[PDB]
Write an enzyme that holds these catalytic residues in place. Structure first.
Site, PDB file in Angstrom:
ATOM      1  CG  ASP A  50      -1.813   1.095   1.407  1.00  0.00           C
ATOM      2  OD1 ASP A  50      -2.068   1.569   2.795  1.00  0.00           O
ATOM      3  OD2 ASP A  50      -1.660   1.892  -0.072  1.00  0.00           O
ATOM      4  CG  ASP A  63      -3.595   3.751  -2.131  1.00  0.00           C
ATOM      5  OD1 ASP A  63      -2.261   3.102  -2.281  1.00  0.00           O
ATOM      6  OD2 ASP A  63      -4.935   4.131  -1.797  1.00  0.00           O
TER       7      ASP A  63
HETATM    8  C1  LIG Z   1      -9.170  -2.156  -2.780  1.00  0.00           C
HETATM    9  O1  LIG Z   1      -9.755  -1.878  -2.349  1.00  0.00           O
HETATM   10  C2  LIG Z   1     -10.387  -0.131  -1.785  1.00  0.00           C
HETATM   11  C3  LIG Z   1      -9.537  -0.422  -0.388  1.00  0.00           C
HETATM   12  C4  LIG Z   1      -8.892   1.401   0.210  1.00  0.00           C
HETATM   13  C5  LIG Z   1      -8.586   1.662   1.483  1.00  0.00           C
HETATM   14  O2  LIG Z   1      -8.791   0.839   2.466  1.00  0.00           O
HETATM   15  N1  LIG Z   1      -7.226   0.807   0.779  1.00  0.00           N
HETATM   16  C6  LIG Z   1      -5.910   1.130   2.020  1.00  0.00           C
HETATM   17  C7  LIG Z   1      -5.468   0.042   2.005  1.00  0.00           C
HETATM   18  C8  LIG Z   1      -5.728  -0.917   1.835  1.00  0.00           C
HETATM   19  C9  LIG Z   1      -5.722  -2.334   1.133  1.00  0.00           C
HETATM   20  C10 LIG Z   1      -7.053  -3.541   0.907  1.00  0.00           C
HETATM   21  C11 LIG Z   1      -7.757  -3.400   1.862  1.00  0.00           C
HETATM   22  C12 LIG Z   1      -7.460  -2.648   3.385  1.00  0.00           C
HETATM   23  C13 LIG Z   1      -6.908  -1.556   3.031  1.00  0.00           C
HETATM   24  C14 LIG Z   1      -5.557   2.206   1.666  1.00  0.00           C
HETATM   25  O3  LIG Z   1      -4.681   2.364   0.346  1.00  0.00           O
HETATM   26  C15 LIG Z   1      -6.200   3.806   1.380  1.00  0.00           C
HETATM   27  N2  LIG Z   1      -5.656   4.541   2.512  1.00  0.00           N
HETATM   28  C16 LIG Z   1      -4.652   5.321   1.844  1.00  0.00           C
HETATM   29  C17 LIG Z   1      -5.969   6.555   0.429  1.00  0.00           C
HETATM   30  C18 LIG Z   1      -6.717   7.235   0.823  1.00  0.00           C
HETATM   31  C19 LIG Z   1      -8.201   7.347   0.442  1.00  0.00           C
HETATM   32  C20 LIG Z   1      -9.060   7.531   1.221  1.00  0.00           C
HETATM   33  C21 LIG Z   1      -9.508   8.464   1.795  1.00  0.00           C
HETATM   34  O4  LIG Z   1     -10.606   8.920   1.945  1.00  0.00           O
HETATM   35  C22 LIG Z   1      -9.412  10.121   2.945  1.00  0.00           C
HETATM   36  O5  LIG Z   1      -8.216  10.138   2.908  1.00  0.00           O
HETATM   37  C23 LIG Z   1      -7.931   9.234   2.194  1.00  0.00           C
HETATM   38  C24 LIG Z   1      -6.247   8.373   1.779  1.00  0.00           C
HETATM   39  C25 LIG Z   1      -6.069   4.509   3.622  1.00  0.00           C
HETATM   40  O6  LIG Z   1      -6.517   4.001   4.114  1.00  0.00           O
HETATM   41  C26 LIG Z   1      -5.282   5.899   4.236  1.00  0.00           C
HETATM   42  C27 LIG Z   1      -5.349   5.786   5.755  1.00  0.00           C
HETATM   43  N3  LIG Z   1      -5.543   7.217   5.935  1.00  0.00           N
HETATM   44  C28 LIG Z   1      -6.161   8.096   6.107  1.00  0.00           C
HETATM   45  O7  LIG Z   1      -6.866   8.047   6.149  1.00  0.00           O
HETATM   46  C29 LIG Z   1      -5.145   9.230   7.034  1.00  0.00           C
HETATM   47  C30 LIG Z   1      -5.258  10.637   7.431  1.00  0.00           C
HETATM   48  C31 LIG Z   1      -4.602  11.213   7.958  1.00  0.00           C
HETATM   49  C32 LIG Z   1      -3.455  10.852   9.063  1.00  0.00           C
HETATM   50  C33 LIG Z   1      -3.012   9.443   8.055  1.00  0.00           C
HETATM   51  C34 LIG Z   1      -4.280   8.620   7.338  1.00  0.00           C
HETATM   52  C35 LIG Z   1      -4.194   7.585   6.835  1.00  0.00           C
HETATM   53  O8  LIG Z   1      -2.698   6.663   7.066  1.00  0.00           O
HETATM   54  C36 LIG Z   1      -9.848   2.040  -0.748  1.00  0.00           C
HETATM   55  C37 LIG Z   1     -10.542   1.927  -1.769  1.00  0.00           C
HETATM   56  O9  LIG Z   1     -11.187   3.087  -2.636  1.00  0.00           O
HETATM   57  C38 LIG Z   1     -11.950   4.438  -1.477  1.00  0.00           C
HETATM   58  C39 LIG Z   1     -10.703   0.703  -2.483  1.00  0.00           C
HETATM   59  O10 LIG Z   1     -11.445   0.349  -3.411  1.00  0.00           O
HETATM   60  C40 LIG Z   1     -13.117   0.105  -3.454  1.00  0.00           C
HETATM   61  C41 LIG Z   1     -13.426  -0.581  -1.530  1.00  0.00           C
HETATM   62  C42 LIG Z   1     -13.283   0.508  -0.518  1.00  0.00           C
HETATM   63  C43 LIG Z   1     -13.620   0.017   1.123  1.00  0.00           C
HETATM   64  C44 LIG Z   1     -14.152  -1.107   0.748  1.00  0.00           C
HETATM   65  C45 LIG Z   1     -14.139  -2.159   0.248  1.00  0.00           C
HETATM   66  C46 LIG Z   1     -13.634  -1.558  -1.440  1.00  0.00           C
END
Ligand SMILES: COc1cc(C(=O)N[C@@H](Cc2ccccc2)[C@@H](O)CN(CCC2CCC3OCOC3C2)C(=O)CCN2C(=O)c3ccccc3C2=O)cc(OC)c1OCc1ccccc1
Length: 331
Positions: free
Chosen positions: A36, A216
């Site tokens: 990630d 990402d």
């Molecule tokens: C592979 O699937 C996905 C996985 C993840 C999905 O969950 N992806 C995360 C990785 C992952 C992959 C598979 C299983 C679980 C988790 C990750 O890459 C997303 N991300 C980064 C970009 C992001 C994405 C969305 C955001 O909203 C606000 O800030 C964001 C940053 C974060 O979670 C940031 C976490 N995080 C913070 O939020 C934050 C705020 C302040 C300081 C430090 C942090 C920190 O470390 C996301 C998806 O997009 C939304 C997907 O597609 C769909 C999906 C979504 C939910 C459930 C199922 C499927």
């Protein structure tokens, strides 16, 4: 004798994720990771983890590793799709053929990461973000490996696999000409947090200047500001609230636009064939628009796998930037 660089083969998982293997502990305990670039911490499930999710995963046993170093500091790791808690620990970490005493989180409670965890096939997540983005202020592995003089460039690249076509590679250490073609452009980060850059977006007549693009690897889709999404969806063959949700359309819809991202030094486009998930087995030319609507304080596009699948990308900690090039279709 071989590639002076560290290459980790990547396997695709249903076009929504791709994994890579790394080890933890003097004894090389194996683990499947989700690489990630969206987070900055590494965690593995512990044998002490007693939640159901953990019974199907690979578990880390410190008592089996001579190089284990107890820390015990409690910590709670949260993503958008869940939380996991455990306590810090330090032990040897083997990524490819580069090993280093690194500090990771030992997870014992994953009940706040379901059904994601159980539903997916990985054990832990390996963050690739920046230190300001991590918990406990831990330096990125790729950076560490630099200071420890095991690699010369604090950089890694991604050549995403393509479901049903070929596998991928994460390369730690240097850039390899075999993954791409055409010029290799470099875009600067606007913040040393996420691998975020500024680009101009163009769809129909729709235009957004100086948009913030976060790159990402952990996002199965492309995110777009909501307003931007619907203006885009007007008329085009697509319902709301499917049977297996979101936006759907006949894969052959000739009205589907092509995204346009332009900078001072580059122009990158994503055609329909790149953001269209297939589901023709549900309808002759039926597809799942792989575009999610998401609003951030300021206009932000998340360039996920759909983008990284078409374009080869390089992440540079030394020259603070993301390099982009046309990924080869088959090497
Ligand atoms: C592979 O699937 C996905 C996985 C993840 C999905 O969950 N992806 C995360 C990785 C992952 C992959 C598979 C299983 C679980 C988790 C990750 O890459 C997303 N991300 C980064 C970009 C992001 C994405 C969305 C955001 O909203 C606000 O800030 C964001 C940053 C974060 O979670 C940031 C976490 N995080 C913070 O939020 C934050 C705020 C302040 C300081 C430090 C942090 C920190 O470390 C996301 C998806 O997009 C939304 C997907 O597609 C769909 C999906 C979504 C939910 C459930 C199922 C499927």
């Amino acid at each position: 004798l071989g590639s002076s660089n560290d290459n980790i083969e990547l396997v695709d998982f249903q076009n929504i994720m791709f994994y890579g293997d790394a080890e933890v502990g003097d004894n090389q305990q194996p683990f499947t990771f989700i690489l990630d670039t969206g987070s900055a911490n590494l965690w593995v499930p512990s044998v002490k983890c007693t939640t159901a999710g953990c019974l199907t995963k690979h578990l880390y046993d410190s008592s089996k590793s001579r190089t284990y170093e107890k820390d015990g500091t409690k910590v709670e790791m949260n993503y958008v799709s869940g939380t996991v808690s455990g306590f810090f620990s330090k032990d040897l970490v083997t990524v490819g053929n580069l090993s280093l005493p690194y500090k990771f989180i030992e997870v014992i409670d994953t009940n706040g990461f379901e059904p994601t965890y159980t539903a997916s096939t990985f054990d832990g997540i390996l963050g690739l973000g920046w230190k300001d983005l991590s918990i406990g202020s831990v330096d990125p592995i790729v950076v560490e490996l630099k200071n420890q003089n095991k690699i010369e460039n604090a950089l890694f690249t991604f050549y995403l696999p393509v479901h049903d076509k070929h596998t991928g590679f994460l390369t730690i250490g240097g850039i390899e000409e075999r993954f791409y073609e055409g010029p290799l452009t470099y875009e600067k980060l606007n913040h040393d947090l996420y691998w975020q850059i500024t680009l101009d977006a163009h769809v129909g007549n729709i235009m957004l200047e100086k948009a913030n693009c976060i790159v990402d690897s952990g996002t199965s889709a492309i995110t777009v500001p909501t307003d931007f999404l619907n203006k885009m969806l007007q008329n085009l063959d697509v319902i709301k609230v499917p049977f297996l949700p979101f936006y759907v359309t006949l894969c052959n819809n000739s009205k589907l636009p092509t995204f346009e991202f332009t900078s001072e030094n580059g122009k990158y486009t994503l055609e329909p064939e790149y953001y269209l998930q297939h589901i023709e087995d549900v309808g002759p030319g039926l597809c799942m628009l792989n575009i999610i609507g998401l609003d951030f304080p300021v206009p932000t596009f998340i360039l996920g796998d759909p983008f990284m699948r078409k374009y080869f990308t390089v992440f540079d900690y030394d020259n603070h930037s993301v390099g982009i090039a046309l990924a080869k279709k088959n090497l």
